[PDB]
Ligand binder design. Structure first.
Ligand SMILES: Cc1ccc(-c2csc(CNC(=O)[C@H]3CCCN(C(=O)COCCF)C3)n2)cn1
Lengths: 211, 230, 216, 195, 211, 211, 206, 195, 216
């Protein structure tokens, strides 16, 4: 898997590939790894798929509950705090390496969360098997002030590097641009038979039931 | 050799218009201890073959001694410049060494890059070979340039550019994204320096004290080691 | 990681590198954390363990500071902050925070691997250095404290160059040189250097970019 | 090591088990009475595995089923009985597992004669012919070859004699004593077959 | 694998399946497990296919040299002893061979069971493989020495069928050879057991067969 | 130190009336990274026999070089080129010679024998082997073997089409390798297809996905 | 290795206004002894929701009982059928509630999302609830690699109920014939908004 | 699992062993012929253990002893035979050892009738009554209770029948077939006792 | 153990502690061994392994020195000794001995855990320092070499105070202070300090009693 994120002017760009693997076998060709936490907060994950998915649902719903109660725009700091507390409560297990981006009152904030409960504020990060290739691209080309278009191009190139250099990564390129006002989730941002004769398969019995 | 103790980090090698350019930092480590920082991790085998290593230093030095003996034997039995062993010969020799050690569960804990020029058709340096003392560069076809990778298990292959260690992730991405045929020396240096900067930033075992070696129509040139500009 | 603290005439200087993890997962990390306006702590060991310990200690420090408030009235890039509490009336003592940290770390020391260096200033004992060690043993240093895989290389160096009553300038120079040597020798430490200087009235944070030139 | 056999027809169901209580390398008894658990209502739980686990699990199931049949004043269905037993075995599977193999047999007016095969891991299924223990490896095939759905009980007993003969000749443990339950004609009959 | 051999009035009947599998994956269902040692002695393959094949061909080589040297046909007992002695020299190396050498020599029809542990059990009814127990049960329930060639073939075919039916590691095609005084004959070169299930157990073929 | 690594990649063999097809990918990979996108797996043994192996690349290359050495020595000694069957027994013996420290290389020996009929022998690491009409070794073997069984055998289809030609088989093999590349992370990049018929060996290339 | 004790495989596919769920019928023991051949792995939750459970047989039965309990409660309390997507989410959460001591089951959910429009709905899971929604087919069980090969090579989009039946049955049978511990009969269920076709295929018993 | 029994009197010596050849949980044969090894000169080596080890060790010993008796043109003494066997077992004890239990029986004019008990470790001693295998635990005591030095061969065989009965009833493996060697009055007899 | 070697103009200087083994088995052990009149070596690691390696290397050095001799004629407690060979005619080269040591240690590096520092002087390369590491990798140092559990603490210290062309007096002071700091910080090192000074014409051997005073 390859997930990456970076902070551009007044926005956060997350990107991810679209492949899930049951080991050597490609189990899903169009999996979605960018996860909606709140309107201004998104997350992407690597590790045990069930852990990522259910931890993300838990965080999303808790954040919505908090927003309803406090009538205040959620905070990336709150999300990372809850996530770290939950991940630490389990002594390492429930492995979830998460790139958590958002835009709040304190601007665009990107965090990297380790499975053991450690968080890091970052300008750009990558996680997954293809993490090193995405990091190579980001390091080589990243710069402090970039437009949303430039951020999207950099994210796409990094994810493509991961896809075409990591065997565990492949498929489409999902990206999401989160701003303090809204988000756009470009799901397919980039996208790099026999008909048997009727009655060929023998049967032993047939039962017809009409609903 | 139960495991690596003194380790050398990434090595990069590429083909450019005028030959082979191989870069490696001059650092050796003792675990997380940067104990040596002026170590020569690229070895000249003969006028047209050079050797880069990653991993244990003792095993790399043993292999370098073996290849030095082989080069001296070849020079002793040499009569014309075509009798000199090519880089491909030395690559096959190193592969056989690693395979035989794999069959004895006594591996060398190294990844080796054997690079050079396979042809005697671009110069006459080996008509009178000099071992103790050191026009324009002649354009060399990329087919006459050899770069061979070998790993602990003996996995041997060749390519237009090779990387070892952490370079196989960071440097290799840039190389595959940007490498092109018939590159000038300036462009090759720019690309390799960008790769080495990434490695310095993301590899804890890498150093910014670099060693660049060129294998060209005028033999093997060892550059002045330099700290990475920025 | 390399975390160091040095006591000079009119304050205490904490310094740290920023490298995290043979792959450098984070090359710009915040190892010196601001527990309180007058009290900082440097982290080393497991990042998750240390970060959660800091969160707990910040919670306890907020509680302590709030409870202290008595009733009624009385009477190279740098960032400088003054203390909002001018007379240290309600700021929790550095020793109190360091010792509650020691208690927390010791109670759960079967799996918490965290080494901390507390630097601070209170009106009782002025400027202070405490070292909360791996297994939960606090030691109050009066000259300097060091920790991390990179601070072993500078030990002798530091011991040679330390003086009893440094000036701010020379203390800053010494701590910077210590961190630079530790980064040079230790592969597990590197990146921009973060320094915090705590004094009677203010705290200032410096960020330093670095390079080690020596013609030995 | 406890050989259990079960056979189900259109008008009968026969359970069978060797009569051996074993302790280390010694036969405690050749007349075991801890494998069959008759349950009022033409139900029978045939248990294998270590004797203590057999006693505990069988008695737990038997008294719970009788408690159900007394409180409600009705006979528990054979399918309900079998799935209750499988549920109870699965509940302990991960806490305090009874290493017991099970053949649940019984006749009911709703589903006829029923034979359920269940293993210590609680993998249960309805079958027409089943076996448990090492002896299974030497009897199952026989049951497969000589079975037809319309067997008479006497033919079933002759097939059981074939199975016992193969268990005496080819099975490593020369088992010679067997006890048989024969539910049919609204009656449960006990038989003892030697050799 | 399920191989069997039994001695009867007219000689010896050898029967085998043809499945080779690698764990739970069926790699082949056309394996020849009955190997010709010489013109009169047949052997079977149970367990390690490479070990059995290599060592039975090696035994064939030794036998051919012996016959050339002494101008005589070797006996089944001698060949079985040679195989057991060779297999014992490799005790502890993980050889997994279960072989039945059945043939005709100057002392009549002979049949020996030899495994990698060094066994040399002589008998007149043997079975090897994961399906050997089912084969023994079926054979014992209906074995008679005075069976005719047709009856013995039917018994062997039915036993192999039942073994393949109850055993995961057995199946494919049933092959039945008859060893007589003048060699051996492929009575059944190969018959897919798919037909045998719907001949023996579910001939009406109007519903799923219930075990 | 574990002396075995699996470099991935797939080889598919398929025989016809008088031709044999061996199509293998060329990607060479370690864990989730790619050594290279072109490392030929198929070696030419003689003008009518080739070998393609999957497993650990160094073992495969040494085994292929040893086969070529022994075949050339055989030609120089006995003054005739070995048949595919001779090569098959030779390779079985070569593999079993390392029975206790086996080559980590599963092999497919394809060729056209003297009687101009396609021959396909499939081998496992320790030497066990059998002739086949369709085979597949490597990471994608479990994905592809059922496709070959459904197309070449049609065991489970009443209405059967049997007339196959070389072009149809080549397109079928291309589809099979495409599916392997689609579902196997270790399969991809360029694939080489060798077709052996009376006129000899013809090599074609096909591009596959690169992720 | 736990999944090797019983074997089994389940396969779901979708067509045009139709959806097929098939499974093998074996119940084995100790990975090689076939103890039953009528052990169906397909369970009906409601007319529009079917589940196929593969893995440990005891875990399959326990999970089916739990799912039936939850679905019956939901439907009675709402006086309406559970939506297929809601059932999928509930199954995921039930699986994940046992993350550390799981039911060793690899379920697939098949059915129709009602919008009337009947859109085929398929999804697969791992033992801890990690779910993948897929638009063409889903596979679970020990025969997963062979089934993925089959549905990769042979899947045709938008097939009528007969075409879908033929394709899914061929895929399942060809995959099973390469598997030692799965087989002994095949069950196939083709749902269309009006009816269900249940067929037992004539399969190998090896 | 290979029960061996040996009894020595003033005018006889009797060896006995169950006739089962086993392979996993199946009896390969109910009439084994790999435990007894008659050695020319009224000698007998009764081996227990694993069939492969039994065959190898027994045949090695037998051919070495026959080679000795042919080269020298004389009969090896039973004591020399037994101690040669123990020496050979001990030699391999620390290099690919044979896990075989041994009873050596014979008759000489120099020491009369002779019985020797030797374990797989090659701990050997002369005895009047000995056993090998799990069955030993159930027969040794019987041999102790009913033995006297002046037993007739027929009384010895009745004691052996007592031992076989106890092995059928109490031993977990219901062993029923036994083969007996009876050396007495210069003749060596073979007997087969069922049940 | 702490073994160090420094290079000053006109010579090289080896220094070592003398503590052996939490029980001090031998509090005065000779680590700097005299391979040849102009060639010394410092031992670290397993005492038995290093001692046997030194014995083997002395045997080889005697062989080499004898074989080198051409035919015909030509032309604070201190102990000083001039070289018997005035022109280094037959004295084996430092590099030769160090490399044969590396060969021996590498050939048997499955169980030989020995780290050595060779200091010497020959007419070819003047004064030389070589470091033979754990698995048998030799590195020629041109400024200084360090090894032992105690030399880690002085690294930065040494790197700061070394100069390219130190004098004999200041080099002696530097190496003595290095060893003293190393023993102060390292529990596995201590005792009297042994220093050897190798030069063009003579070798001196100093023994130093020590005490670490500081007012940090
Ligand atoms: C007697 C006999 C029967 C069949 C075979 C044989 C050898 S190959 C083959 C068909 N194909 C497979 O069985 C694959 C099944 C999955 C595992 N396979 C791999 O190749 C994976 O390993 C990667 C590196 F080796 C082989 N039948 C050999 N002798």
């Amino acid at each position: 898997t390859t997930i990456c994120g970076l902070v551009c002017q007044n926005a956060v760009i997350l990107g991810a590939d679209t492949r899930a693997t049951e080991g050597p076998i490609v189990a899903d060709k169009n999996c979605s790894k960018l996860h909606y936490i709140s309107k201004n907060i998104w997350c992407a994950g690597a590790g045990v798929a069930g852990d990522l998915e259910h931890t993300t649902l838990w965080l999303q719903h808790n954040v919505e509950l908090h927003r309803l109660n406090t009538n205040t725009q959620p905070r990336v700091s709150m999300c990372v705090s809850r996530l770290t507390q939950e991940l630490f409560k389990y002594q390492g297990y429930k492995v979830c390496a998460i790139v958590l981006g958002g835009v709040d009152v304190n601007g665009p904030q990107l965090y990297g969360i380790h499975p053991h409960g450690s968080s890091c504020l970052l300008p750009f990060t990558a996680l997954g098997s293809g993490s090193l290739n995405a990091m190579a691209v980001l390091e080589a080309k990243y710069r402090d002030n970039m437009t949303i278009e430039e951020g999207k191009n950099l994210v796409c190139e990094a994810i493509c590097a991961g896809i075409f250099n990591d065997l565990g990564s492949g498929g489409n390129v999902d990206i999401c641009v989160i701003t303090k006002d809204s988000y756009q989730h470009i799901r397919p941002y980039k996208e790099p038979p026999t008909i048997y004769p009727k009655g060929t398969t023998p049967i032993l019995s047939e039962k017809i039931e009409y609903i | 050799t139960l495991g690596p103790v003194v380790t050398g980090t990434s090595v990069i090698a590429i083909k450019y218009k005028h030959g082979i350019m191989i870069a490696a930092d001059r650092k050796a480590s003792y675990g997380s201890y940067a104990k040596f920082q002026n170590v020569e991790r690229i070895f000249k085998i003969n006028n047209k073959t050079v050797m880069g290593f990653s991993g244990e230093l003792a095993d790399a030095q043993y292999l370098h001694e073996l290849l030095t003996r082989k080069n001296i034997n070849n020079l002793s039995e040499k009569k014309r410049k075509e009798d000199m062993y090519t880089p491909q010969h030395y690559h096959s020799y190193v592969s056989r060494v690693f395979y035989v050690r794999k069959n004895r569960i006594d591996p060398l804990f190294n990844n080796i890059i054997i690079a050079g020029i396979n042809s005697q058709k671009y110069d006459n340096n080996d008509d009178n070979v000099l071992l103790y003392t050191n026009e324009e560069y002649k354009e060399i076809h990329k087919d006459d340039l050899y770069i061979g990778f070998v790993d602990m298990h003996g996995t041997n292959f060749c390519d237009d550019y090779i990387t070892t260690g952490y370079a196989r992730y960071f440097a290799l991405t840039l190389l595959r994204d940007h490498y092109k045929d018939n590159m000038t020396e300036e462009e090759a240096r720019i690309l390799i320096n960008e790769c080495l900067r990434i490695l310095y930033f993301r590899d804890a075992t890498s150093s910014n004290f670099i060693q660049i070696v060129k294998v060209t129509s005028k033999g093997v040139e060892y550059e002045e080691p330099y700290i990475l500009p920025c | 990681t390399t975390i160091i603290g040095i006591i000079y005439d009119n304050g205490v200087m904490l310094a740290c590198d920023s490298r995290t993890s043979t792959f450098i997962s984070n090359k710009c990390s915040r190892k010196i954390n601001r527990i309180n306006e007058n009290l900082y702590v440097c982290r080393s060991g497991a990042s998750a363990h240390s970060q959660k310990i800091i969160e707990i200690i910040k919670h306890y420090c907020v509680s302590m500071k709030n409870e202290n408030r008595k009733k009624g009235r009385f009477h190279v890039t740098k960032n400088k902050y003054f203390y909002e509490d001018k007379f240290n009336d309600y700021n929790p003592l550095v020793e109190n925070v360091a010792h509650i940290t020691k208690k927390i770390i010791y109670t759960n020391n079967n799996f918490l691997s965290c080494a901390l260096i507390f630097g601070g200033y209170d009106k009782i004992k002025k400027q202070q250095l405490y070292a909360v060690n791996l297994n939960g043993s606090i030691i109050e240093k009066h000259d300097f404290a060091v920790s991390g895989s990179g601070s072993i290389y500078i030990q002798s160096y530091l011991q040679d160059k330390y003086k009893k009553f440094m000036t701010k300038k020379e203390c800053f120079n010494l701590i910077l040189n210590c961190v630079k040597y530790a980064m040079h020798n230790d592969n597990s430490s590197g990146g921009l250097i973060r320094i915090v200087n705590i004094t009677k009235s203010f705290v200032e944070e410096f960020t330093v970019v670095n390079t080690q030139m020596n013609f030995q | 090591m406890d050989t259990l056999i079960g056979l189900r027809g259109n008008n009968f169901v026969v359970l069978a088990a060797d009569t051996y209580s074993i302790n280390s390398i010694i036969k405690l008894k050749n007349d075991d009475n801890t494998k069959f658990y008759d349950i009022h209502g033409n139900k029978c739980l045939l248990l294998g595995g270590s004797i203590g686990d057999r006693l505990q699990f069988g008695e737990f199931i038997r008294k719970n089923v009788h408690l159900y049949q007394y409180q409600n004043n009705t006979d528990m269905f054979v399918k309900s009985f079998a799935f209750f037993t499988r549920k109870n075995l699965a509940y302990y599977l991960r806490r305090n597992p009874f290493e017991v193999n099970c053949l649940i047999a019984g006749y009911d007016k709703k589903d006829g004669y029923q034979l359920y095969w269940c293993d210590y891991l609680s993998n249960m299924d309805s079958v027409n012919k089943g076996a448990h223990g090492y002896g299974a490896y030497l009897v199952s095939a026989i049951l497969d070859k000589y079975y037809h759905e319309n067997l008479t009980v006497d033919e079933a007993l002759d097939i059981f004699k074939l199975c016992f003969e193969e268990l005496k000749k080819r099975f490593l443990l020369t088992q010679i004593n067997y006890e048989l339950r024969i539910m049919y004609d609204n009656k449960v009959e006990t038989q003892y077959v030697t050799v | 694998t399920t191989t069997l051999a039994f001695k009867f009035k007219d000689g010896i009947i050898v029967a085998v399946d043809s499945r080779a599998s690698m764990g739970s994956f069926i790699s082949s269902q056309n394996v020849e497990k009955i190997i010709e040692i010489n013109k009169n002695i047949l052997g079977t393959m149970a367990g390690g296919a490479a070990d059995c094949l290599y060592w039975e061909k090696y035994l064939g080589k030794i036998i051919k040299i012996y016959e050339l040297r002494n101008n005589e046909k070797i006996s089944v007992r001698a060949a079985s002893t040679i195989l057991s002695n060779i297999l014992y020299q490799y005790k502890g190396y993980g050889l997994c061979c279960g072989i039945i050498l059945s043939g005709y020599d100057h002392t009549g029809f002979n049949m020996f069971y030899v495994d990698d542990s060094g066994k040399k059990v002589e008998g007149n009814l043997f079975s090897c493989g994961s399906g050997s127990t089912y084969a023994y049960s079926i054979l014992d329930s209906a074995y008679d020495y005075n069976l005719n060639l047709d009856q013995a073939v039917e018994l062997a075919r039915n036993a192999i069928y039942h073994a393949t039916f109850r055993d995961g590691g057995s199946g494919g095609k049933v092959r039945v050879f008859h060893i007589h005084k003048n060699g051996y004959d492929k009575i059944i070169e190969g018959e897919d057991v798919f037909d045998l299930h719907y001949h023996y157990t579910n001939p009406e073929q109007k519903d799923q067969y219930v075990m | 130190w574990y002396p075995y690594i699996d470099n991935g990649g797939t080889v598919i063999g398929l025989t016809g009336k008088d031709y044999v097809i061996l199509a293998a990918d060329t990607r060479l990979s370690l864990s989730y990274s790619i050594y290279t996108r072109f490392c030929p797996k198929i070696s030419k043994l003689t003008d009518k026999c080739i070998i393609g192996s999957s497993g650990m690349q160094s073992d495969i290359k040494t085994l292929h070089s040893l086969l070529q050495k022994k075949i050339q020595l055989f030609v120089l000694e006995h003054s005739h080129y070995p048949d595919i069957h001779v090569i098959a027994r030779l390779l079985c013996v070569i593999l079993y010679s390392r029975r206790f420290f086996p080559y980590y290389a599963f092999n497919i020996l394809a060729g056209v024998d003297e009687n101009n009929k396609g021959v396909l022998y499939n081998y496992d690491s320790v030497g066990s082997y059998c002739e086949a009409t369709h085979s597949c070794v490597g990471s994608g073997s479990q994905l592809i073997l059922p496709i070959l069984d459904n197309r070449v055998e049609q065991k489970n289809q009443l209405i059967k089409n049997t007339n196959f030609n070389l072009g149809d088989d080549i397109n079928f093999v291309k589809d099979a390798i495409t599916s392997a590349t689609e579902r196997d992370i270790y399969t991809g990049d360029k694939t080489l297809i060798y077709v052996i018929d009376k006129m000899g060996i013809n090599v074609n290339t096909l591009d596959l996905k690169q992720d | 290795s736990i999944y090797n004790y019983n074997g089994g495989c389940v396969l779901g596919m979708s067509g045009s206004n139709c959806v097929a769920i098939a499974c093998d019928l074996r119940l084995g023991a100790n990975t090689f002894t076939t103890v039953s051949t009528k052990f169906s792995k397909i369970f009906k939750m409601n007319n529009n929701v079917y589940v196929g459970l593969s893995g440990l047989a005891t875990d399959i039965q326990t999970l089916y009982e739990i799912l039936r309990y939850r679905v019956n409660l939901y439907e009675v309390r709402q006086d309406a059928e559970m939506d297929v997507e809601c059932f999928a989410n509930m199954l995921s959460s039930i699986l994940y509630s046992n993350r550390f001591s799981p039911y060793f089951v690899n379920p697939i959910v098949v059915g129709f999302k009602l919008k009337v429009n009947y859109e085929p709905y398929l999804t697969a899971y791992d033992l801890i609830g990690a779910k993948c929604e897929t638009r063409d087919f889903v596979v679970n069980g020990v025969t997963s690699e062979q089934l993925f090969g089959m549905c990769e090579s042979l899947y045709v989009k938008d097939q009528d109920e007969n075409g879908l039946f033929e394709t899914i049955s061929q895929c399942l049978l060809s995959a099973l014939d390469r598997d030692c511990i799965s087989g002994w009969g095949a069950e196939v269920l083709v749902l269309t908004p009006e009816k269900i076709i249940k067929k037992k295929l004539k399969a190998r018993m090896d």
